Amino acid sequence: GKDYLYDTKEENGKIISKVVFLQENGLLNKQVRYEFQYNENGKVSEKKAFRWDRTNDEWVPFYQITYQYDDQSGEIKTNYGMWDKKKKNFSLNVQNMIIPSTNYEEIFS
């Protein structure tokens, strides 16, 4: 079965990072690391996700989402890109999607 151990760092009131460990059949492995940055209004502006590379034991960038907010829309506009290991940017498989504002807290995984 799957259980999860979460390690969350907060600076004052804001989550800055979260690591998810997968617990499965008595094993414990790093699964994903999230890092968060915030706009001037204190809302999340950027989420970066890292994979755990077991060949080298290091966090490697995986994807990046940026978030834009609108007064009247009730909607958050998100722009996602995957890490391109040659270009060293998030230019692969770029896609846009809308999150309802009511699901804001789910950004923190």
Pairing assessment for the beta strands 58-69 and 89-100 based on DSSP bridges: unpaired
* Residue pair 90/64 in contact by the 8 Å Cβ criterion: yes
Give the span between the Cα atoms of 35 and 19, in whole angstroms.
9
Report resolution in angstroms. Answer: 1.5
**Domains present along the chain, CATH in parentheses:** 1-109 (2.40.128.720)
Structure method: X-ray
How long a stretch of residues is the chain?
109
Query: Is 18:7 a contact under the CB 8 Å cutoff?
Result: yes
b/e 73-100 (16+ beta carbons within 10 angstroms → b): eeebebebbbbeeeeeebeeeeeeeeee
Cα diameter, the chain: 49
* Structure tokens given for 96: 């846009």
Residue 93, both tokens? 């498989």
